[PDB]
C-alpha cells in the first residue's frame, strides 16, 4: 500500500570500521560489529513510501527537499535489490519515498543509520519483497542494518562474496537487561574531516593497527561481550566498550592522512569517566565515541542519577537541553545531592553539552498507520 515506518539509531560498542575486499558496493565489513538499539523516542527517522503507476520515475524527498534518485547510488542500490526480490506484479511499479527525521540539527547524530533502516522496512512492506530489512538497509548504510532489531544486535560479517550471509541478528532483546541505559552527551564537532565511508577505507589502507584488529581483537571482544551481555556483567561490558572506543580513535590517529573526529571536550569526557570510575572504585560508567565528537555513555539505571549529577558539575547543562525517554529518571537526577568527592575530577573549562539524550535499550522498527504518513492523500 502506502507504508510508514519509524526507525531508531543504534550505537556500536564493537565497532564497524572498514569494508573488506569485494565489499564496497555490497557493504561487506572486515569484522563483526555489535550495537545497542536506542529508543525511537524522542528522536527517530520516519519514511513513507507509496507505490505508483501514474509516474515515470522513482522519487525521493529528504527533509522536505526532492532529491535526484539517479544521483543517490545507495538508494538506487536498495531499489535494484528490492525489485529483484519482489512479485512480478510489483517489479515494475515506481515508488515515491519521503523521508525525514527530528534529530536536533547540528547534533551529528547517526541519523543515516535510522533513515536507511526506516526506508528499507517501508520499501520491503510496500513491494512485498522477500529480502529482510537488515540486508536491504545494509546496502544503504552498514550501520543501518543493526537498527532492524531491538536490543543488542550483532552485524555478522559473513563469508559469502554475494553478501547473502552478511546480516544483523538480535543477540538479546530489550527485555534481557532492562537496567542498562544509554546516554549521548552531544558535543560540538571537530573541524570537518573525511566522511566515515571514505575514512574507514583510508584506515584499512594505511593504519598499522587494522590487521591485528580484524584478525585477533574483534573476534576476542565479540566473545567477551557476548558472555558479558548474557551474564549482565556491566563492568566487563563497559571495559570492552571503552577499549573499542579507544582503539577506533587510535586507528584514526594512525591513519594517513590522520583522521580526527574527537575534540578536547571529547578527551575531557574520557578523562572524566575514568576519574569517576577511579573515585567510585569500580567501572560504573562507560564512554564510547563513533566517528564524531559526541560521547555515548552506558550506565545502569541505579547509577545514572549520580553519574549525570557528576557530569553537570563539569559540563553544566540546563535541563531544557536534556532529552530523557524516562521522565521519572530525570526527576531523580534533579534531587541528587552529589558528594564532594565527585566534583573537580578533571581540569577542563566548564561548558554545557549541546544536549544530553537518555534512552533505555530500544525495541526497533515500528510500522505506523495511514494517519502518520508523510505522504498526503
TrEMBL record:
Any one Pfam family match given in the protein's UniProt record, by short name: MDD_C
GO CC entries = cilium; cytoplasm; cytosol; nucleoplasm
Give, as in the UniProt entry, the pathway in which the protein acts.
Steroid biosynthesis; cholesterol biosynthesis
Reaction it catalyzes:
(R)-5-diphosphomevalonate + ATP = isopentenyl diphosphate + ADP + phosphate + CO2
Q: Which UniProt keywords apply?
A: ATP-binding, Cholesterol biosynthesis, Cholesterol metabolism, Lipid biosynthesis, Lipid metabolism, Lyase, Nucleotide-binding, Steroid biosynthesis, Steroid metabolism, Sterol biosynthesis, Sterol metabolism
Q: What is its EC number?
A: 4.1.1.33
* Keyword Plastid tagged: no
Q: Where do the Mvd1 C-terminal domain residues begin and end?
A: 183-364
Name of the top EC class for this enzyme: lyase
The GO biological-process annotations, alphabetized, read as:
cholesterol biosynthetic process; isopentenyl diphosphate biosynthetic process, mevalonate pathway; phosphorylation
Molecular functions (GO terms): ATP binding; diphosphomevalonate decarboxylase activity; kinase activity
**Domain called Diphosphomevalonate decarboxylase-like N-terminal: residue spans:** 7-168
Q: What does this protein do?
A: Catalyzes the ATP dependent decarboxylation of (R)-5-diphosphomevalonate to form isopentenyl diphosphate (IPP). Functions in the mevalonate (MVA) pathway leading to isopentenyl diphosphate (IPP), a key precursor for the biosynthesis of isoprenoids and sterol synthesis.
Q: Which family does it belong to?
A: Belongs to the diphosphomevalonate decarboxylase family.
User: PANTHER family, from UniProt?
Assistant: DIPHOSPHOMEVALONATE DECARBOXYLASE
State the protein's name.
Diphosphomevalonate decarboxylase
